[PDB]
Write an enzyme that holds these catalytic residues in place. Sequence first.
Site, short mmCIF file in Angstrom:
data_model
loop_
_atom_site.label_atom_id
_atom_site.label_comp_id
_atom_site.label_asym_id
_atom_site.label_seq_id
_atom_site.Cartn_x
_atom_site.Cartn_y
_atom_site.Cartn_z
N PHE A 2 0.81 -1.21 0.00
CA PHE A 2 0.00 0.00 0.00
C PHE A 2 0.85 1.26 0.00
O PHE A 2 2.08 1.20 0.01
CB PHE A 2 -0.93 -0.01 1.22
CG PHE A 2 -1.66 -1.32 1.40
CD1 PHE A 2 -1.08 -2.36 2.11
CD2 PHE A 2 -2.91 -1.52 0.81
CE1 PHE A 2 -1.73 -3.58 2.25
CE2 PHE A 2 -3.57 -2.74 0.94
CZ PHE A 2 -2.98 -3.78 1.66
N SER A 41 -6.32 -8.00 -1.51
CA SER A 41 -5.78 -7.53 -0.24
C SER A 41 -6.26 -6.11 0.02
O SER A 41 -6.09 -5.23 -0.83
CB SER A 41 -4.25 -7.54 -0.26
OG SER A 41 -3.74 -8.85 -0.18
N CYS A 48 -3.26 -5.43 6.52
CA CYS A 48 -3.55 -6.13 5.27
C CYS A 48 -4.39 -7.36 5.57
O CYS A 48 -3.98 -8.23 6.34
CB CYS A 48 -2.25 -6.55 4.57
SG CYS A 48 -2.59 -7.44 3.04
N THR A 50 -7.33 -10.32 3.70
CA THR A 50 -7.79 -10.94 2.46
C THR A 50 -9.31 -11.01 2.33
O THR A 50 -10.00 -11.54 3.21
CB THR A 50 -7.24 -12.39 2.34
OG1 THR A 50 -5.81 -12.37 2.43
CG2 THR A 50 -7.67 -13.04 1.03
N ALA A 64 -7.14 -13.37 11.81
CA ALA A 64 -6.48 -14.33 12.68
C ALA A 64 -6.17 -13.76 14.06
O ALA A 64 -5.99 -12.56 14.22
CB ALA A 64 -5.18 -14.82 12.02
N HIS A 102 1.58 -4.78 7.33
CA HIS A 102 1.95 -5.70 8.40
C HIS A 102 2.28 -4.89 9.65
O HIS A 102 3.40 -4.43 9.83
CB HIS A 102 3.14 -6.56 7.96
CG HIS A 102 2.76 -7.70 7.07
ND1 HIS A 102 3.68 -8.55 6.50
CD2 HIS A 102 1.54 -8.15 6.68
CE1 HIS A 102 3.04 -9.47 5.79
NE2 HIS A 102 1.74 -9.25 5.88
N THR A 148 4.24 11.97 8.80
CA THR A 148 5.60 12.40 9.03
C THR A 148 5.91 12.59 10.52
O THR A 148 5.23 13.35 11.21
CB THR A 148 5.87 13.73 8.29
OG1 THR A 148 5.47 13.60 6.92
CG2 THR A 148 7.35 14.09 8.35
O1 LIG Z 1 -0.33 -10.94 1.06
C1 LIG Z 1 -1.14 -11.90 1.11
O2 LIG Z 1 -1.41 -12.62 0.11
C2 LIG Z 1 -1.78 -12.20 2.44
C3 LIG Z 1 -2.72 -11.09 2.97
C4 LIG Z 1 -3.00 -11.16 4.45
N1 LIG Z 1 -4.19 -11.56 4.80
C5 LIG Z 1 -4.59 -11.68 6.20
C6 LIG Z 1 -5.97 -12.13 6.54
O3 LIG Z 1 -6.75 -12.39 5.63
N2 LIG Z 1 -6.28 -12.24 7.87
C7 LIG Z 1 -5.37 -11.94 8.84
O4 LIG Z 1 -5.64 -12.04 10.03
N3 LIG Z 1 -4.13 -11.53 8.46
C8 LIG Z 1 -3.68 -11.38 7.17
N4 LIG Z 1 -2.46 -10.96 6.86
C9 LIG Z 1 -1.48 -10.60 7.91
C10 LIG Z 1 -1.78 -9.37 8.83
O5 LIG Z 1 -1.71 -8.19 7.99
C11 LIG Z 1 -0.81 -9.24 10.03
O6 LIG Z 1 -0.99 -10.41 10.84
C12 LIG Z 1 -1.07 -7.95 10.88
O7 LIG Z 1 -0.78 -6.78 10.08
C13 LIG Z 1 -0.21 -7.86 12.17
O8 LIG Z 1 1.17 -7.91 11.83
C14 LIG Z 1 -2.07 -10.84 5.57
O9 LIG Z 1 -0.95 -10.46 5.24
O1 LIG Z 2 5.44 11.93 1.27
C1 LIG Z 2 5.71 12.71 2.23
O2 LIG Z 2 6.86 13.13 2.48
C2 LIG Z 2 4.57 13.16 3.10
C3 LIG Z 2 3.96 12.08 4.05
C4 LIG Z 2 2.63 12.52 4.61
N1 LIG Z 2 2.66 13.12 5.76
C5 LIG Z 2 1.45 13.62 6.40
C6 LIG Z 2 1.55 14.30 7.72
O3 LIG Z 2 2.64 14.42 8.25
N2 LIG Z 2 0.38 14.76 8.28
C7 LIG Z 2 -0.82 14.60 7.64
O4 LIG Z 2 -1.85 15.01 8.14
N3 LIG Z 2 -0.84 13.96 6.45
C8 LIG Z 2 0.25 13.45 5.77
N4 LIG Z 2 0.17 12.83 4.59
C9 LIG Z 2 -1.13 12.62 3.90
C10 LIG Z 2 -2.16 11.57 4.41
O5 LIG Z 2 -1.49 10.29 4.43
C11 LIG Z 2 -3.44 11.48 3.51
O6 LIG Z 2 -4.02 12.79 3.44
C12 LIG Z 2 -4.49 10.47 4.07
O7 LIG Z 2 -3.90 9.16 4.14
C13 LIG Z 2 -5.77 10.35 3.19
O8 LIG Z 2 -5.41 9.94 1.86
C14 LIG Z 2 1.28 12.37 3.98
O9 LIG Z 2 1.27 11.79 2.89
HG LIG Z 3 -0.14 -7.90 2.67
#
Ligand SMILES: O=C(O)CCc1nc2c(=O)[nH]c(=O)[nH]c2n(C[C@H](O)[C@H](O)[C@H](O)CO)c1=O
Ligand SMILES: O=C(O)CCc1nc2c(=O)[nH]c(=O)[nH]c2n(C[C@H](O)[C@H](O)[C@H](O)CO)c1=O
Ligand SMILES: [Hg+2]
Length: 202
Positions: A2, A41, A48, A50, A64, A102, A148
């Site tokens: 992402f 995802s 993240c 599924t 999980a 993650h 930031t």
């Molecule tokens: O990349 C892929 O193909 C797998 C996607 C995915 N799915 C799950 C899920 O469905 N349920 C889940 O419970 N977890 C999944 N996760 C992992 C999850 O994000 C992680 O346990 C937390 O962020 C804490 O660290 C996954 O990565």
């Molecule tokens: O790329 C860079 O150097 C800037 C990083 C960054 N920082 C902030 C922040 O500090 N405060 C903020 O308030 N926003 C920041 N954002 C943007 C923010 O994520 C976005 O508006 C939401 O997710 C909805 O889409 C940023 O992207």
């Molecule tokens: Hg993932």
Amino acid sequence: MFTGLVEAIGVVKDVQGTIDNGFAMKIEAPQILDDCHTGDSIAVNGTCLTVTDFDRYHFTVGIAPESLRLTNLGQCKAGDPVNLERAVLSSTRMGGHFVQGHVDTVAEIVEKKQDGEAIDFTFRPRDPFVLKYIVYKGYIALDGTSLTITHVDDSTFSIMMISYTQSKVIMAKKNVGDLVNVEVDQIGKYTEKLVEAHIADW
Ligand SMILES: O=C(O)CCc1nc2c(=O)[nH]c(=O)[nH]c2n(C[C@H](O)[C@H](O)[C@H](O)CO)c1=O
Ligand SMILES: O=C(O)CCc1nc2c(=O)[nH]c(=O)[nH]c2n(C[C@H](O)[C@H](O)[C@H](O)CO)c1=O
Ligand SMILES: [Hg+2]
């Protein structure tokens, strides 16, 4: 994978299961279901997950026990808002950063004050050691939001939320005591091993 640029705020509609065995969760988010497909995802509060099923209005996921243990998803209840972002596989990042979805740990909001048009947040991570991967002006993802770092010390870190972001993420309305998902910028863990594998020769 992402970017940390939250696309929408969905609403939890149903949660079933337990902390020890896992949750089955249904989320309403028509804004991002036009191109859904089973297996996709989606990051929910930066976690993240599924897609197990979906329709034009809702999508379901299986969470999980470990995911529930390291994030705030274990506290989810029908009616709660969640940050959402669809996955994207791209080697470029012109906006946000490389967010894996993650989550490392959770952090408790310990201070929240207005600074002009922005909101000054201060967080205390449950696992202080993640602070070694957080630096002044560095990136970080809180509840899946790319932000930031404006300050950091031995027990906390802070960020400034601008006006544009306040209406796009759930953080804007969270208060002292609430938990947020923390994912440190992955590059930091990489450089750590680099120096380790380095002095592994010295
Ligand atoms: O990349 C892929 O193909 C797998 C996607 C995915 N799915 C799950 C899920 O469905 N349920 C889940 O419970 N977890 C999944 N996760 C992992 C999850 O994000 C992680 O346990 C937390 O962020 C804490 O660290 C996954 O990565
Ligand atoms: O790329 C860079 O150097 C800037 C990083 C960054 N920082 C902030 C922040 O500090 N405060 C903020 O308030 N926003 C920041 N954002 C943007 C923010 O994520 C976005 O508006 C939401 O997710 C909805 O889409 C940023 O992207
Ligand atoms: Hg993932």
